[PDB]
Protein backbone atom coordinates (compact mmCIF):
# COMPACT_ATOMS: atom_id res chain seq x y z
CA UNK A 1 0.00 0.00 0.00
CA UNK A 2 2.98 2.27 -0.69
CA UNK A 3 4.14 3.75 -3.99
CA UNK A 4 6.32 6.82 -3.57
CA UNK A 5 6.51 9.70 -6.05
CA UNK A 6 9.46 12.08 -6.31
CA UNK A 7 9.22 15.76 -7.22
CA UNK A 8 12.07 18.26 -7.71
CA UNK A 9 11.56 22.03 -8.00
CA UNK A 10 13.25 25.45 -7.99
CA UNK A 11 15.40 24.33 -10.92
CA UNK A 12 18.53 26.24 -12.10
CA UNK A 13 17.08 27.91 -15.21
CA UNK A 14 13.99 27.95 -17.44
CA UNK A 15 14.66 26.44 -20.87
CA UNK A 16 12.73 27.04 -24.10
CA UNK A 17 11.05 24.49 -26.33
CA UNK A 18 13.38 25.84 -29.01
CA UNK A 19 16.03 25.03 -26.44
CA UNK A 20 14.94 21.38 -26.47
CA UNK A 21 17.76 19.10 -27.54
CA UNK A 22 18.72 15.41 -27.22
CA UNK A 23 21.29 15.99 -24.46
CA UNK A 24 18.48 16.76 -22.04
CA UNK A 25 17.37 13.11 -22.23
CA UNK A 26 16.94 11.51 -18.83
CA UNK A 27 17.51 14.92 -17.27
CA UNK A 28 15.65 17.47 -15.16
CA UNK A 29 14.72 20.71 -16.86
CA UNK A 30 12.43 23.68 -16.18
CA UNK A 31 10.06 24.83 -18.95
CA UNK A 32 6.83 26.87 -18.94
CA UNK A 33 4.03 27.77 -21.37
CA UNK A 34 0.33 27.65 -22.26
CA UNK A 35 -1.93 24.56 -22.08
CA UNK A 36 -3.64 22.94 -25.05
CA UNK A 37 -6.35 20.28 -24.75
CA UNK A 38 -6.27 18.54 -21.40
CA UNK A 39 -7.31 14.91 -22.03
CA UNK A 40 -9.23 12.66 -19.64
CA UNK A 41 -7.28 10.81 -16.94
CA UNK A 42 -6.68 7.09 -17.48
CA UNK A 43 -4.66 4.67 -15.29
CA UNK A 44 -0.94 3.87 -15.39
CA UNK A 45 -0.16 0.18 -15.23
CA UNK A 46 2.93 0.42 -13.11
CA UNK A 47 2.96 -3.28 -12.17
CA UNK A 48 0.45 -6.03 -13.04
CA UNK A 49 -0.36 -9.61 -12.01
CA UNK A 50 -0.92 -11.26 -15.38
CA UNK A 51 -0.64 -15.08 -15.27
CA UNK A 52 -0.99 -17.86 -16.15
CA UNK A 53 0.77 -18.51 -18.66
CA UNK A 54 -0.62 -22.15 -18.72
CA UNK A 55 -2.52 -22.74 -16.64
CA UNK A 56 -2.18 -20.86 -13.33
CA UNK A 57 1.19 -19.31 -12.40
CA UNK A 58 -0.31 -16.36 -10.52
CA UNK A 59 2.97 -14.47 -11.01
CA UNK A 60 2.42 -10.86 -9.95
CA UNK A 61 5.04 -8.10 -10.23
CA UNK A 62 6.85 -5.79 -12.65
CA UNK A 63 5.82 -5.71 -16.33
CA UNK A 64 6.36 -1.96 -15.99
CA UNK A 65 7.89 -1.59 -19.47
CA UNK A 66 6.57 1.01 -21.88
CA UNK A 67 4.22 -0.91 -24.12
CA UNK A 68 2.93 -1.91 -21.60
CA UNK A 69 2.36 -5.50 -22.65
CA UNK A 70 3.30 -8.01 -21.57
CA UNK A 71 3.60 -10.38 -18.64
CA UNK A 72 4.03 -14.12 -19.47
CA UNK A 73 7.74 -13.44 -19.95
CA UNK A 74 9.93 -16.29 -18.62
CA UNK A 75 7.21 -17.99 -16.46
CA UNK A 76 6.32 -19.77 -14.33
CA UNK A 77 8.21 -22.28 -13.73
CA UNK A 78 6.96 -24.68 -14.84
CA UNK A 79 4.04 -23.03 -16.72
CA UNK A 80 6.15 -22.48 -19.88
CA UNK A 81 4.63 -19.25 -21.20
CA UNK A 82 4.65 -17.84 -23.93
CA UNK A 83 0.91 -18.67 -24.04
CA UNK A 84 -1.54 -16.08 -22.75
CA UNK A 85 -0.25 -13.55 -20.24
CA UNK A 86 -3.03 -14.17 -19.13
CA UNK A 87 -3.96 -10.68 -18.07
CA UNK A 88 -4.60 -10.33 -14.37
CA UNK A 89 -5.94 -6.83 -13.89
CA UNK A 90 -7.15 -6.87 -10.30
CA UNK A 91 -3.81 -7.14 -8.48
CA UNK A 92 -2.30 -4.33 -10.53
CA UNK A 93 -1.82 -1.03 -8.72
CA UNK A 94 -2.55 1.94 -11.00
CA UNK A 95 -1.94 5.71 -11.03
CA UNK A 96 -2.89 8.92 -12.89
CA UNK A 97 -2.49 9.88 -16.01
CA UNK A 98 -3.46 12.51 -18.55
CA UNK A 99 -1.70 13.93 -21.60
CA UNK A 100 -1.69 17.73 -21.76
CA UNK A 101 -0.02 19.35 -24.75
CA UNK A 102 1.66 22.61 -23.80
CA UNK A 103 1.93 25.46 -26.29
CA UNK A 104 4.89 27.81 -26.43
CA UNK A 105 4.08 31.26 -25.03
CA UNK A 106 3.50 34.24 -27.31
CA UNK A 107 5.45 36.93 -25.46
CA UNK A 108 8.74 35.12 -26.00
CA UNK A 109 8.08 33.61 -29.44
CA UNK A 110 9.49 35.71 -32.32
CA UNK A 111 6.74 36.62 -34.82
CA UNK A 112 6.44 35.41 -37.41
CA UNK A 113 6.92 32.02 -35.77
CA UNK A 114 3.95 29.66 -35.32
CA UNK A 115 5.36 28.15 -32.08
CA UNK A 116 6.27 24.47 -32.34
CA UNK A 117 5.06 22.63 -29.26
CA UNK A 118 4.91 19.14 -27.80
CA UNK A 119 3.19 17.13 -25.08
CA UNK A 120 3.58 17.41 -21.32
CA UNK A 121 2.47 14.19 -19.66
CA UNK A 122 1.33 14.55 -16.08
CA UNK A 123 2.54 11.31 -14.46
CA UNK A 124 2.57 11.75 -10.70
CA UNK A 125 -0.10 13.25 -8.43
CA UNK A 126 0.94 16.55 -10.02
CA UNK A 127 -1.54 15.43 -12.68
CA UNK A 128 -4.63 17.58 -13.35
CA UNK A 129 -3.39 20.57 -11.31
CA UNK A 130 -2.97 22.55 -14.52
CA UNK A 131 -5.53 24.89 -16.07
CA UNK A 132 -5.84 25.83 -19.78
CA UNK A 133 -4.15 29.07 -20.87
CA UNK A 134 -1.71 29.29 -17.98
CA UNK A 135 2.08 29.08 -18.11
CA UNK A 136 3.59 26.68 -15.60
CA UNK A 137 7.03 25.61 -14.34
CA UNK A 138 7.76 21.99 -15.26
CA UNK A 139 10.35 19.27 -14.57
CA UNK A 140 12.28 18.14 -17.65
CA UNK A 141 12.81 14.37 -18.23
CA UNK A 142 13.27 14.74 -22.00
CA UNK A 143 13.14 11.06 -23.08
CA UNK A 144 11.40 9.77 -26.28
CA UNK A 145 8.22 8.02 -27.62
CA UNK A 146 7.47 5.12 -30.08
CA UNK A 147 4.72 5.18 -32.74
CA UNK A 148 15.09 6.50 -39.59
CA UNK A 149 16.05 3.67 -37.18
CA UNK A 150 14.52 0.23 -36.76
CA UNK A 151 15.53 -2.60 -34.44
CA UNK A 152 16.68 -5.41 -36.70
CA UNK A 153 16.31 -8.88 -35.21
CA UNK A 154 10.76 2.47 -36.15
CA UNK A 155 10.23 6.16 -35.48
CA UNK A 156 10.61 8.21 -32.32
CA UNK A 157 9.93 11.74 -31.05
CA UNK A 158 10.17 14.09 -28.07
CA UNK A 159 8.10 13.18 -25.05
CA UNK A 160 8.18 15.73 -22.29
CA UNK A 161 7.35 14.52 -18.81
CA UNK A 162 7.52 16.17 -15.40
CA UNK A 163 7.68 14.46 -12.03
CA UNK A 164 7.00 17.94 -10.69
CA UNK A 165 4.94 20.91 -11.88
CA UNK A 166 3.93 24.28 -10.45
CA UNK A 167 1.30 26.68 -11.82
CA UNK A 168 3.58 29.74 -11.76
CA UNK A 169 3.47 31.83 -14.93
CA UNK B 1 3.75 27.58 -52.99
CA UNK B 2 2.49 29.14 -56.19
CA UNK B 3 2.04 32.88 -56.45
CA UNK B 4 -0.14 33.67 -59.44
CA UNK B 5 -0.41 36.81 -61.57
CA UNK B 6 1.56 39.58 -59.86
CA UNK B 7 4.21 37.01 -58.94
CA UNK B 8 4.12 34.76 -62.01
CA UNK B 9 5.34 37.17 -64.64
CA UNK B 10 7.17 40.02 -62.92
CA UNK B 11 8.85 43.08 -64.47
CA UNK B 12 6.05 42.63 -67.00
CA UNK B 13 2.46 43.69 -67.63
CA UNK B 14 -0.55 42.34 -65.78
CA UNK B 15 -3.64 42.43 -67.97
CA UNK B 16 -7.03 42.49 -66.25
CA UNK B 17 -10.71 42.47 -67.17
CA UNK B 18 -13.74 42.18 -64.85
CA UNK B 19 -11.49 44.31 -62.64
CA UNK B 20 -14.35 45.26 -60.33
CA UNK B 21 -15.18 41.59 -59.73
CA UNK B 22 -11.68 40.95 -58.35
CA UNK B 23 -13.49 41.41 -55.01
CA UNK B 24 -11.42 42.67 -52.09
CA UNK B 25 -9.17 39.60 -52.32
CA UNK B 26 -7.10 41.11 -55.08
CA UNK B 27 -8.14 44.67 -54.30
CA UNK B 28 -6.04 45.47 -51.21
CA UNK B 29 -2.98 43.63 -52.49
CA UNK B 30 -2.98 45.39 -55.87
CA UNK B 31 -3.84 48.45 -53.76
CA UNK B 32 -0.33 47.84 -52.45
CA UNK B 33 1.08 47.02 -55.93
CA UNK B 34 0.49 50.67 -56.89
CA UNK B 35 3.19 51.38 -54.32
CA UNK B 36 4.66 48.66 -56.54
CA UNK B 37 7.91 46.89 -55.64
CA UNK B 38 6.37 44.35 -53.20
CA UNK B 39 3.61 41.91 -52.27
CA UNK B 40 3.44 41.12 -48.55
CA UNK B 41 2.33 37.71 -47.27
CA UNK B 42 1.75 36.96 -43.58
CA UNK B 43 -0.40 33.88 -44.32
CA UNK B 44 0.63 30.63 -42.60
CA UNK B 45 4.25 30.52 -41.43
CA UNK B 46 5.67 32.61 -44.25
CA UNK B 47 6.03 36.34 -43.53
CA UNK B 48 7.89 37.47 -46.68
CA UNK B 49 7.07 40.26 -49.04
CA UNK B 50 7.91 38.93 -52.51
CA UNK B 51 8.53 41.17 -55.47
CA UNK B 52 5.68 41.99 -57.73
CA UNK B 53 7.55 44.10 -60.22
CA UNK B 54 4.55 43.53 -62.46
CA UNK B 55 3.17 46.16 -64.74
CA UNK B 56 -0.53 46.78 -64.26
CA UNK B 57 -3.28 47.18 -66.81
CA UNK B 58 -6.96 46.47 -66.68
CA UNK B 59 -10.01 46.61 -68.84
CA UNK B 60 -12.51 48.31 -66.59
CA UNK B 61 -16.02 47.03 -67.16
CA UNK B 62 -18.40 49.51 -65.50
CA UNK B 63 -21.47 48.36 -63.61
CA UNK B 64 -24.58 47.26 -65.54
CA UNK B 65 -25.41 47.87 -68.18
CA UNK B 66 -23.44 50.81 -69.53
CA UNK B 67 -21.95 54.06 -68.27
CA UNK B 68 -24.47 56.92 -68.18
CA UNK B 69 -23.25 60.27 -69.67
CA UNK B 70 -25.31 62.45 -67.29
CA UNK B 71 -23.80 60.62 -64.31
CA UNK B 72 -20.70 61.99 -62.61
CA UNK B 73 -17.41 60.10 -63.09
CA UNK B 74 -16.66 57.32 -60.55
CA UNK B 75 -20.40 56.63 -60.46
CA UNK B 76 -20.00 54.09 -63.26
CA UNK B 77 -16.88 52.76 -61.53
CA UNK B 78 -17.44 50.50 -58.53
CA UNK B 79 -13.78 50.59 -57.45
CA UNK B 80 -12.44 52.46 -54.40
CA UNK B 81 -11.87 56.21 -54.78
CA UNK B 82 -8.33 55.77 -53.46
CA UNK B 83 -7.39 53.24 -56.15
CA UNK B 84 -7.99 55.40 -59.23
CA UNK B 85 -5.36 57.99 -58.36
CA UNK B 86 -3.03 55.01 -58.17
CA UNK B 87 -3.17 54.40 -61.92
CA UNK B 88 -1.46 57.05 -64.04
CA UNK B 89 -4.05 57.50 -66.75
CA UNK B 90 -7.18 55.81 -68.01
CA UNK B 91 -9.09 55.73 -71.32
CA UNK B 92 -12.87 55.51 -71.12
CA UNK B 93 -14.37 53.69 -74.09
CA UNK B 94 -17.86 54.85 -74.92
CA UNK B 95 -19.76 53.10 -77.65
CA UNK B 96 -21.97 55.77 -79.21
CA UNK B 97 -24.02 55.00 -82.33
CA UNK B 98 -22.93 56.99 -85.36
CA UNK B 99 -24.71 56.36 -88.66
CA UNK B 100 -21.27 56.84 -90.23
CA UNK B 101 -18.74 54.84 -88.21
CA UNK B 102 -21.13 52.00 -87.45
CA UNK B 103 -21.36 51.51 -91.20
CA UNK B 104 -17.65 50.80 -91.65
CA UNK B 105 -18.03 48.91 -88.37
CA UNK B 106 -20.77 46.62 -89.65
CA UNK B 107 -18.81 46.25 -92.85
CA UNK B 108 -15.93 45.36 -90.55
CA UNK B 109 -18.11 42.75 -88.87
CA UNK B 110 -19.24 41.50 -92.29
CA UNK B 111 -15.65 41.47 -93.54
CA UNK B 112 -16.07 38.34 -91.46
CA UNK B 113 -16.95 35.67 -92.41
CA UNK B 114 -16.42 36.67 -96.06
CA UNK B 115 -12.66 36.87 -95.55
CA UNK B 116 -9.98 35.91 -93.02
CA UNK B 117 -7.57 38.88 -93.36
CA UNK B 118 -9.38 42.08 -92.33
CA UNK B 119 -7.19 45.12 -93.12
CA UNK B 120 -6.55 46.86 -96.46
CA UNK B 121 -6.17 50.18 -98.31
CA UNK B 122 -3.79 50.26 -96.56
CA UNK B 123 -1.62 49.02 -93.73
CA UNK B 124 1.03 46.35 -93.30
CA UNK B 125 0.92 44.85 -89.78
CA UNK B 126 4.11 45.07 -87.71
CA UNK B 127 4.98 41.64 -86.33
CA UNK B 128 5.88 41.02 -82.65
CA UNK B 129 9.46 39.65 -82.90
CA UNK B 130 11.16 42.50 -84.75
CA UNK B 131 8.98 45.00 -82.84
CA UNK B 132 9.70 43.48 -79.41
CA UNK B 133 13.38 43.74 -80.13
CA UNK B 134 13.16 47.53 -80.58
CA UNK B 135 10.86 47.66 -77.56
CA UNK B 136 13.59 45.82 -75.61
CA UNK B 137 16.21 47.97 -77.35
CA UNK B 138 14.54 51.04 -75.91
CA UNK B 139 14.30 50.09 -72.21
CA UNK B 140 18.09 50.00 -72.21
CA UNK B 141 18.32 53.57 -73.54
CA UNK B 142 17.48 55.24 -70.22
CA UNK B 143 16.81 58.91 -71.10
CA UNK B 144 17.85 61.76 -68.85
CA UNK B 145 15.64 64.85 -68.75
CA UNK B 146 17.15 68.15 -69.76
CA UNK B 147 16.27 70.87 -67.25
CA UNK B 148 14.46 73.05 -69.81
CA UNK B 149 11.86 70.37 -70.43
CA UNK B 150 11.86 69.73 -66.65
CA UNK B 151 10.84 73.30 -65.84
CA UNK B 152 8.28 73.11 -68.65
CA UNK B 153 6.97 69.95 -66.94
CA UNK B 154 6.50 72.20 -63.93
CA UNK B 155 4.84 75.27 -65.51
CA UNK B 156 1.94 73.90 -67.59
CA UNK B 157 1.52 71.49 -64.71
CA UNK B 158 0.79 74.46 -62.48
CA UNK B 159 -2.25 75.36 -64.55
CA UNK B 160 -2.87 71.62 -64.67
CA UNK B 161 -2.76 71.90 -60.87
CA UNK B 162 -5.14 74.83 -61.20
CA UNK B 163 -7.87 73.94 -63.74
CA UNK B 164 -8.65 70.58 -62.14
CA UNK B 165 -8.74 72.48 -58.83
CA UNK B 166 -10.39 75.72 -59.99
CA UNK B 167 -13.14 73.50 -61.39
CA UNK B 168 -13.62 72.82 -57.66
CA UNK B 169 -16.59 70.54 -57.00
Swiss-Prot record, chain A:
Residues of the signal sequence?
none
Which residues, renumbered to this chain, carry the PTM Phosphoserine?
113
Where does the source fall among the domains of life?
Eukaryota
Q: Where is it located?
A: Nucleus
Record note on quaternary structure: Component of the MCM2-7 complex. The complex forms a toroidal hexameric ring with the proposed subunit order MCM2-MCM6-MCM4-MCM7-MCM3-MCM5; loaded onto DNA, forms a head-head double hexamer. Interacts with MCM10.
What else is noted? Answer: Present with 13400 molecules/cell in log phase SD medium.
Role, per record: Acts as a component of the MCM2-7 complex (MCM complex) which is the putative replicative helicase essential for 'once per cell cycle' DNA replication initiation and elongation in eukaryotic cells. The active ATPase sites in the MCM2-7 ring are formed through the interaction surfaces of two neighboring subunits such that a critical structure of a conserved arginine finger motif is provided in trans relative to the ATP-binding site of the Walker A box of the adjacent subunit. The six ATPase active sites, however, are likely to contribute differentially to the complex helicase activity.
The family line of this record is: Belongs to the MCM family.
Name of the protein in question:
DNA replication licensing factor MCM6
What gene is this protein a product of?
Answer: MCM6
Q: Which residues of the full protein are shown?
A: 260 to 463 of 1017
Curated annotation (Swiss-Prot), chain B:
Question: In the record, what terms sit under GO molecular function?
Answer: ATP binding; ATP hydrolysis activity; chromatin binding; DNA replication origin binding; MCM complex binding; single-stranded DNA helicase activity
Keyword Transit peptide attached = no
Gene Ontology BP term (one): DNA replication initiation
Taxonomically, the superkingdom here is Eukaryota
| TM spans (from-to) | none
From the record, what ranges are coiled-coil?
Answer: none
Q: In which residues is ATP 2 bound?
A: 86
Indicate where this protein is primarily found: cytoplasm
GO CC annotations, alphabetized: chromosome, telomeric region; CMG complex; cytoplasm; DNA replication preinitiation complex; MCM complex; MCM core complex; nuclear pre-replicative complex; nuclear replication fork
Q: For the motif Arginine finger, what are the positions?
A: 85-88
Q: Which UniProt keywords apply?
A: ATP-binding, Cell cycle, Cytoplasm, DNA replication, DNA-binding, Helicase, Hydrolase, Nucleotide-binding, Nucleus, Phosphoprotein
Q: Does the keyword Zinc apply?
A: no
- Localization (cell): Cytoplasm; Nucleus
Q: For ATP 1, which residues are the binding ones?
A: 61
> Family per UniProt?
Belongs to the MCM family.
Q: So what does this one do?
A: Acts as a component of the MCM2-7 complex (MCM complex) which is the putative replicative helicase essential for 'once per cell cycle' DNA replication initiation and elongation in eukaryotic cells. Core component of CDC45-MCM-GINS (CMG) helicase, the molecular machine that unwinds template DNA during replication, and around which the replisome is built.
Subunit relationships: Component of the MCM2-7 complex. The complex forms a toroidal hexameric ring with the proposed subunit order MCM2-MCM6-MCM4-MCM7-MCM3-MCM5; loaded onto DNA, forms a head-head double hexamer. Interacts with CSM1 and MCM10.
Miscellaneous comment as given in the Swiss-Prot or TrEMBL entry: Present with 166 molecules/cell in log phase SD medium.
Q: What is this protein called?
A: DNA replication licensing factor MCM7
Gene name of the record? MCM7
Give from-to of the shown chain within the full protein: 508 to 676 of 845
